[PDB]
Write the structure tokens for this entry.
Amino acid sequence: EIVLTQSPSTLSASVGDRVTITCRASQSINNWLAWYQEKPGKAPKLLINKASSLESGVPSRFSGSGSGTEFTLTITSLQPDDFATYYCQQYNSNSWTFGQGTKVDMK
Amino acid sequence: EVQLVESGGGLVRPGGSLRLSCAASGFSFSSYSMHWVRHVPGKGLVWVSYINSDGSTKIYADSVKGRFSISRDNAKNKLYLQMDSLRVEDTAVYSCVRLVHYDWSPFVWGQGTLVTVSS
Amino acid sequence: TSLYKGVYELQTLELNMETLNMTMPLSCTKNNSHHYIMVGNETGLELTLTNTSIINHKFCNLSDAHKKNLYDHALMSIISTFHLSIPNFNQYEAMSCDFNGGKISVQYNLSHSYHCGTVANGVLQTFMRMAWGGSYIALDSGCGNWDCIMTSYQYLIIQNTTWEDHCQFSRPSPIGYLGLLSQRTRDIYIS
Amino acid sequence: TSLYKGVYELQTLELNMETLNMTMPLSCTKNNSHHYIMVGNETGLELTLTNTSIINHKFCNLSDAHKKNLYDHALMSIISTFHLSIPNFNQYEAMSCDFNGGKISVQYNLSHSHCGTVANGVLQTFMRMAWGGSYIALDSGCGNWDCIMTSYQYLIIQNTTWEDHCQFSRPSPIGYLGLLSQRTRDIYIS
Amino acid sequence: TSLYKGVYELQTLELNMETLNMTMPLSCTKNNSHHYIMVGNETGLELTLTNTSIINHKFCNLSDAHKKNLYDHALMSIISTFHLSIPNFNQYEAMSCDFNGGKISVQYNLSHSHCGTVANGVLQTFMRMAWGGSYIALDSGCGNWDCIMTSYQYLIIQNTTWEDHCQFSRPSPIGYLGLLSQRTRDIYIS
Amino acid sequence: GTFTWTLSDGYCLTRWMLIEAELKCFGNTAVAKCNEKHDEEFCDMLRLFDFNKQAIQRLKAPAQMSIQLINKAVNALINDQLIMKNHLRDIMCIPYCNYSKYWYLNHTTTGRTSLPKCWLVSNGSYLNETHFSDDIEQQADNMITEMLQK
Amino acid sequence: GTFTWTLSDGYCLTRWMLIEAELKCFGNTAVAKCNEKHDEEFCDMLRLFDFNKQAIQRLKAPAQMSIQLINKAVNALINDQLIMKNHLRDIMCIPYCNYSKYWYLNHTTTGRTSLPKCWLVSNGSYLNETHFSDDIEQQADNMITEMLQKE
Amino acid sequence: GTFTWTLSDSEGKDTPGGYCLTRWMLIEAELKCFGNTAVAKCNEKHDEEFCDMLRLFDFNKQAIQRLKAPAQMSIQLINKAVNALINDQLIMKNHLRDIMCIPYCNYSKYWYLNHTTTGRTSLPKCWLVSNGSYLNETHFSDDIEQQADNMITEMLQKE
Ligand SMILES: *[C@@H]1O[C@H](CO)[C@@H](O[C@@H]2O[C@H](CO)[C@@H](O[C@@H]3O[C@H](CO[C@H]4O[C@H](CO)[C@@H](O)[C@H](O)[C@@H]4O)[C@@H](O)[C@H](O[C@H]4O[C@H](CO)[C@@H](O)[C@H](O)[C@@H]4O[C@H]4O[C@H](CO)[C@@H](O)[C@H](O)[C@@H]4O)[C@@H]3O)[C@H](O)[C@H]2NC(C)=O)[C@H](O)[C@H]1NC(C)=O
Ligand SMILES: *[C@@H]1O[C@H](CO)[C@@H](O[C@@H]2O[C@H](CO)[C@@H](O[C@@H]3O[C@H](CO[C@H]4O[C@H](CO)[C@@H](O)[C@H](O)[C@@H]4O)[C@@H](O)[C@H](O[C@H]4O[C@H](CO)[C@@H](O)[C@H](O)[C@@H]4O[C@H]4O[C@H](CO)[C@@H](O)[C@H](O)[C@@H]4O)[C@@H]3O)[C@H](O)[C@H]2NC(C)=O)[C@H](O)[C@H]1NC(C)=O
Ligand SMILES: *[C@@H]1O[C@H](CO)[C@@H](O[C@@H]2O[C@H](CO)[C@@H](O[C@@H]3O[C@H](CO)[C@@H](O)[C@H](O[C@H]4O[C@H](CO)[C@@H](O)[C@H](O[C@H]5O[C@H](CO)[C@@H](O)[C@H](O)[C@@H]5O)[C@@H]4O)[C@@H]3O)[C@H](O)[C@H]2NC(C)=O)[C@H](O)[C@H]1NC(C)=O
Ligand SMILES: *[C@@H]1O[C@H](CO)[C@@H](O[C@@H]2O[C@H](CO)[C@@H](O[C@@H]3O[C@H](CO)[C@@H](O)[C@H](O[C@H]4O[C@H](CO[C@H]5O[C@H](CO)[C@@H](O)[C@H](O)[C@@H]5O)[C@@H](O)[C@H](O)[C@@H]4O)[C@@H]3O)[C@H](O)[C@H]2NC(C)=O)[C@H](O)[C@H]1NC(C)=O
Ligand SMILES: *[C@@H]1O[C@H](CO)[C@@H](O[C@@H]2O[C@H](CO)[C@@H](O[C@@H]3O[C@H](CO[C@H]4O[C@H](CO)[C@@H](O)[C@H](O)[C@@H]4O)[C@@H](O)[C@H](O[C@H]4O[C@H](CO)[C@@H](O)[C@H](O)[C@@H]4O)[C@@H]3O)[C@H](O)[C@H]2NC(C)=O)[C@H](O)[C@H]1NC(C)=O
Ligand SMILES: *[C@@H]1O[C@H](CO)[C@@H](O[C@@H]2O[C@H](CO)[C@@H](O[C@@H]3O[C@H](CO)[C@@H](O)[C@H](O)[C@@H]3O)[C@H](O)[C@H]2NC(C)=O)[C@H](O)[C@H]1NC(C)=O
Ligand SMILES: *[C@@H]1O[C@H](CO)[C@@H](O[C@@H]2O[C@H](CO)[C@@H](O[C@@H]3O[C@H](CO)[C@@H](O)[C@H](O)[C@@H]3O)[C@H](O)[C@H]2NC(C)=O)[C@H](O)[C@H]1NC(C)=O
Ligand SMILES: *[C@@H]1O[C@H](CO)[C@@H](O[C@@H]2O[C@H](CO)[C@@H](O)[C@H](O)[C@H]2NC(C)=O)[C@H](O)[C@H]1NC(C)=O
Ligand SMILES: *[C@@H]1O[C@H](CO)[C@@H](O[C@@H]2O[C@H](CO)[C@@H](O)[C@H](O)[C@H]2NC(C)=O)[C@H](O)[C@H]1NC(C)=O
Ligand SMILES: *[C@@H]1O[C@H](CO)[C@@H](O[C@@H]2O[C@H](CO)[C@@H](O)[C@H](O)[C@H]2NC(C)=O)[C@H](O)[C@H]1NC(C)=O
Ligand SMILES: *[C@@H]1O[C@H](CO)[C@@H](O[C@@H]2O[C@H](CO)[C@@H](O)[C@H](O)[C@H]2NC(C)=O)[C@H](O)[C@H]1NC(C)=O
Ligand SMILES: *[C@@H]1O[C@H](CO)[C@@H](O[C@@H]2O[C@H](CO)[C@@H](O)[C@H](O)[C@H]2NC(C)=O)[C@H](O)[C@H]1NC(C)=O
Ligand SMILES: *[C@@H]1O[C@H](CO)[C@@H](O[C@@H]2O[C@H](CO)[C@@H](O)[C@H](O)[C@H]2NC(C)=O)[C@H](O)[C@H]1NC(C)=O
Ligand SMILES: *[C@@H]1O[C@H](CO)[C@@H](O)[C@H](O)[C@H]1NC(C)=O
Ligand SMILES: *[C@@H]1O[C@H](CO)[C@@H](O)[C@H](O)[C@H]1NC(C)=O
Ligand SMILES: *[C@@H]1O[C@H](CO)[C@@H](O)[C@H](O)[C@H]1NC(C)=O
Ligand SMILES: *[C@@H]1O[C@H](CO)[C@@H](O)[C@H](O)[C@H]1NC(C)=O
């Protein structure tokens, strides 16, 4: 019954640029938000969990925040390898909800 | 090491059925709850179903009701998902996820397997 | 070369302690987390420092396992030695196991209390001795801190494995296991 | 006798360890199936390897024995050492006891169980406590360990007197004293 | 002073073991009925031989003490050694404890019981832990063992400070360290 | 724990502790060796004998004969590992010390003996001198050497 | 266990560890004896002192002052059986080592001492030299002998 | 807590006291032999790590050759031998030195000093380690030199 909204749906960026995306929850999900990086042809990779805990094997340039309903994922300096669709997931229900995703394009 | 391995994928004709199974290994599986998640490559990742470690709770995504039956064999450490009346929109790669809250590495993912529904 | 007093050479030897496997357990380190206790030339225990749980049961029915007697005795003896040697252990809720199936699986929760009085410190100190010979890289603590050691892992997991040449960082050595034999009853609290 | 280097004569000493009966128990061997532990010149314990049972109930009610405190501690202590020193003891169903009015009587059912079992562990403690006789009593006098068993079904230890004198070998404190060093080794967590 | 062989002079050393307060507890004697164990320069335990009771209930609720974990382990450890080292302890009814808010307080009722009893065993552990003072505190300074008793009814060990200074004899780590060697000997099976 | 008991006041074995009716005496050399060596079964037994003698003379006991005292004293008095060594040798088919019998190598003209070494046993009986002749000859040389160094 | 700790770097007792004013030093002989003898109470205490010194300099402690470390270190540092021996002698009415006081037999012209032996006590007080005169005389001969063998 | 195994029984036959290390005992050389003085020192002295290892190896050899192989190589036998075979406090000593970040023996590499025209090496001493690696001769020099003088002294005493 928790619906997540991500925004902006699309954003473009330069390589090495700083970008942020958001995720907005309806009910509270505490800090149980996860983020995924989806590349064409691949299963999504988990990047972040517990709102801001960086997952193993994920570059330090990735970060994030939020502990209520307002959340974010950030990249300090975007790499050519980070142009991906990013998704937020809440897991405070045992019925997981994923947002619609946001896409980072190169400009 | 903690691991989840799916099997049983393949091609199903619309309206048909397929039984997935997932082997758990290296942990005390019968004590943990489990989730099924499916991936559609042109869409985001979506949730399918959840089962309690003792089987007392079984829930499903609103987009999939009456078609799926989730169960667990604690003696053999196998998670099952029986799907019937399969629709074209159910084509996806299905995989096992072991989510444990308060675990420092909360999501154990399997590899998954492809279930295709087509003519 | 290294000719002392003009008449003696300094020469070395290294002992191939693996040949002692037939009579005594040998410890060895892989990566900076996995540690193995090798038994004979067939089996042993794998000691893993991890961020993943294996048991969310929170029970450890040693007496059920004993009544059934389906477990390997050499391996249970090693588990007992490890456990009993944990100093100042009284946080029983921090330990769980799954001694069913004739197998061994033991979990110690290092985050149960997270200062120096924590069971986590006691568990890590035994770990340091049981896997002495690479346990220091896995601990990832500076030296001179044994009295108060904490690590980056949530659990110490011990599970039965099979024989393999499970060595990268250190060489098999009986010393850890043997050293613990004198510490079995030390640092025990009243009931 | 024999002079080494044509100078040094061998002569022998044989020690009388009976003079050590006070301050330490002595382990005595009589006739293969029977061994004794004597304390001073008043009491002792008979250790018998048999195919017969004396008690059968599986209730080693130690708590009552302690509360009643009707048992001579000298022998309770020896029994404690014998039992605790049994390695890898994980079968409580393997033994029965009787502490009724003191009169301590302990029976181990070696027929509970083939290497490494409790029954073999029971014989190993026996082997040491009765070191002067166990060479014969247990058949496999040397060349074996772990995979040790005898013809008997039970090891029975009972309250007796001190007047039952040795026959096979002289009494010696060594068995008991040796078992005092390691009384907590090879114990399971339980 | 005195020259041995007209050459070698005796002179003496006396060691200041107070410098050992960190890394090891020191056992202190004050005035026959009172002995102390000090840890570093922060805490300690008072050991008193008395005819008065402080607690009376017989529920040494250690399980709660462990779960609560509100007690400084340095002293919980010392108390455990004291208790576990008491030989032949078979009377749990002989002692009461108080762990409410930590504040450890342990009372042994030597008036539970005449040789070889628990009360005597309690005094023997005391004798060693308080070795520097026990010579006087227990009356039977030497020439006796097992058949030892004092005028006091209780041995009470309580949580205190480190500022209570010795008077009878200098503090020394030897009592405590000596009791670390044998902590599991003379233990009944139970 | 090492041996820490030092033999009391030149040392004799009372005739009452010997299977042989006549008691025997040893010189200073034997006594000194028991305070330096950590692995001699003979010296190990002597410490038990002195303990017994002192406990009997100085303490009284309430019927139990102070088993609780030996349970503590035993680590200062004996080398438990000599016991374990002889035990391991007995598990294996290896001759070992049975504590009851000793070599007592003597000297015909000086009246001086070696520290007696333990007579080994195997297969339910005592060994013949032939089987440990090498050690007897070594001990005779050891006594010769000590006199030469003196 | 036997003593296994080896005394650290000719060895001196800091003035801070001595009741008597003025620290004192020992030569190589005393140090060497503590690594060979297994039964000397003086050497036994020195090992505790080195341990204490090293633990203080190298390790920090969370108020408890590492009691858990000594509980392990104690077997490498001391001979517990010296303690049991002195205890047994105390049970019996036999003079025994009280650890706190030592003979320190000195040498007027060479500036060299014996390994100090423990001063025995009995009956609540320290023994008079008369009662252990035999041991003092033996120790003086032992020092003479060692010098003669050196020569 | 002294050791008692004393290198077992009649292993010092042939070259007297010539206890040797075989190719399966050594990492590289197929054979290294030490003289009777190495064994005499091992049997009498109570603080050398190399010596404790000889006892563990010697035990292993005897148990394997003389006893019926126990099912599953049960640990029970070694648990009754360890106190007779090794100084448990050498392990504790090296452990404490590791704790205190002091160079210590981890029982791997050993060094011995070997005369170039004769033989009769020193008993091997443990090569110490610190901070994840082996120490240099730079830090061992004082002991290597002392061992060299000890060996010279012994030759002179023999004379
Ligand atoms: C390891 O160390 C032990 C010591 O701890 C060493 O001692 C052995 O002790 C046993 C028991 O004392 C000895 O066995 C005795 O052997 C003698 C001689 O045996 C001959 O004569 C008998 C007669 O039937 C024959 O059967 C035998 O084959 C020989 O020919 C016996 O005389 C002993 O019996 C007497 O003493 C027993 C114990 O008191 C009595 O039960 C028995 O009735 C006899 O007693 C007579 O004298 C008593 C004196 O007090 C008196 O009270 C009685 O009323 C009666 O008149 C006994 O069977 C064995 O010989 C000792 N050692 C040796 C070989 O000398 C172990 O031998 C040693 N083991 C090893 C090798 O590892
Ligand atoms: C076994 O080993 C121990 C050492 O471990 C050995 O040492 C004995 O230690 C005790 C305790 O230190 C000594 O007892 C002291 O004796 C001195 C001298 O006593 C004379 O003066 C008093 C004055 O009333 C008389 O009663 C007595 O009969 C003598 O004539 C006393 O001066 C000591 O008291 C002082 O120190 C105490 C401890 O700090 C204080 O409680 C007391 O108030 C005194 O303190 C003064 O100085 C302090 C310095 O820091 C200061 O802080 C205080 O404020 C104050 O100004 C104490 O009673 C005993 O004498 C030592 N040994 C001997 C015999 O000399 C044991 O003796 C030894 N046992 C055996 C069996 O030999
Ligand atoms: C290893 O050691 C660590 C030490 O930290 C342990 O971590 C601790 O685990 C406990 C147990 O899980 C945590 O307790 C929680 O505390 C929060 C505080 O708000 C509380 O909300 C939570 O409630 C949970 O259990 C309830 C039991 O009935 C459930 O009812 C409740 O469900 C409701 O709420 C959720 C979301 O909040 C909804 O999704 C549900 O639908 C329902 O509405 C919920 O499940 C617990 O009481 C403790 O916080 C945690 N410690 C830390 C620091 O985080 C590990 O568990 C331990 N692991 C092992 C294997 O031993
Ligand atoms: C100590 O040493 C031991 C070995 O001595 C190390 O343990 C080994 O770890 C290996 C993996 O690193 C593992 O191999 C696996 O074998 C199975 C066989 O089926 C493969 O399936 C494995 O994974 C493959 O596929 C994954 C895909 O995962 C990614 O994508 C999914 C998409 O959903 C994400 O959810 C996921 O998070 C990832 O992003 C690839 O990632 C893998 O690279 C691989 O292609 C592995 O091949 C060994 O079995 C294992 N052996 C043992 C005994 O442990 C151990 O890790 C090391 N410890 C340390 C601290 O370094
Ligand atoms: C006491 O303390 C010392 C110091 O820390 C320890 O010494 C280390 O011991 C280990 C084990 O013997 C040594 O590790 C070995 O190194 C060999 C060479 O490594 C180089 O080449 C490889 C090639 O792939 C590189 O990856 C590596 O970075 C180096 O450049 C390896 O060949 C050895 O591996 C062999 O066995 C494994 C088994 O699985 C096989 O997979 C391999 O292919 C190969 O056959 C091994 O990794 C280490 O170098 C030593 N350190 C030092 C400083 O010398 C003692 O072990 C320790 N002892 C005790 C008892 O605690
Ligand atoms: C576990 O330990 C055992 C015992 O040390 C190891 O086995 C031993 O391996 C050596 C070779 O390294 C064998 O040597 C051979 O002996 C025969 C004798 O006839 C000879 O002909 C050969 O040329 C060779 O020298 C030794 O016999 C063998 N011993 C046993 C009991 O098998 C074993 O390899 C170790 N295993 C592991 C996995 O570490
Ligand atoms: C950890 O220990 C367990 C318990 O011993 C190991 O699992 C066990 O492995 C044996 C084979 O080695 C299995 O027995 C065999 O089963 C097959 C049928 O599947 C049968 O045909 C054979 O004759 C034999 O009986 C046993 O069932 C199995 N038990 C369990 C609980 O899994 C496990 O493999 C060990 N860990 C590792 C990493 O090896
Ligand atoms: C330890 O034993 C207990 C029982 O003694 C096991 O838990 C029981 O599980 C049954 C399942 O039907 C319940 O009805 C009982 O009420 C449970 N008992 C308790 C005390 O909770 C437990 O799973 C066992 N644990 C292990 C590691 O084997
Ligand atoms: C040791 O065992 C013997 C039996 O062989 C016990 O003998 C009698 O036990 C009853 C028990 O109610 C007493 O009333 C009798 O007085 C005992 N007989 C004699 C002659 O004393 C003996 O009591 C047992 N000893 C102990 C301490 O329990
Ligand atoms: C110490 O122990 C004695 C003996 O058990 C206790 O005193 C007994 O109290 C009961 C109370 O009903 C009386 O009937 C007994 O007659 C008393 N016996 C004696 C010998 O006095 C005493 O109260 C205990 N004290 C504490 C603090 O536990
Ligand atoms: C040691 O005992 C003393 C009593 O002599 C305790 O003193 C107080 O205990 C209460 C318990 O609720 C605390 O709230 C107070 O803060 C303590 N007072 C002081 C000055 O600290 C002391 O807490 C006990 N120590 C421990 C570790 O339990
Ligand atoms: C072996 O040692 C004994 C030890 O005393 C010597 O026996 C003594 O012999 C003298 C006369 O030579 C007697 O006066 C003593 O009574 C004997 N002592 C005993 C045993 O009571 C014996 O002579 C020595 N033998 C050799 C070869 O020198
Ligand atoms: C006993 O040993 C001490 C050990 O130092 C000697 O005391 C030193 O005396 C010298 C001058 O002779 C002083 O320079 C030192 O300061 C003293 N050391 C101390 C104790 O601080 C003492 O002379 C020796 N006595 C005899 C008889 O030789
Ligand atoms: C038996 O014990 C009593 C105890 O008083 C003693 O007097 C008697 O001499 C002893 N008799 C023996 C061993 O024959
Ligand atoms: C042991 O005690 C139980 C009650 O706790 C009783 O039913 C049983 O009969 C007793 N057994 C014996 C042998 O006395
Ligand atoms: C008491 O302990 C504190 C701990 O920080 C220390 O700083 C202080 O110097 C000590 N004072 C003493 C022993 O007088
Ligand atoms: C000990 O716990 C029991 C319940 O298990 C309780 O009834 C009793 O009052 C407690 N005693 C004390 C001294 O707290």
Observations:
- Chain D has two domains: 1-22, 23-190.
- Chains D and G do not touch (no CB pair under 8 Å).
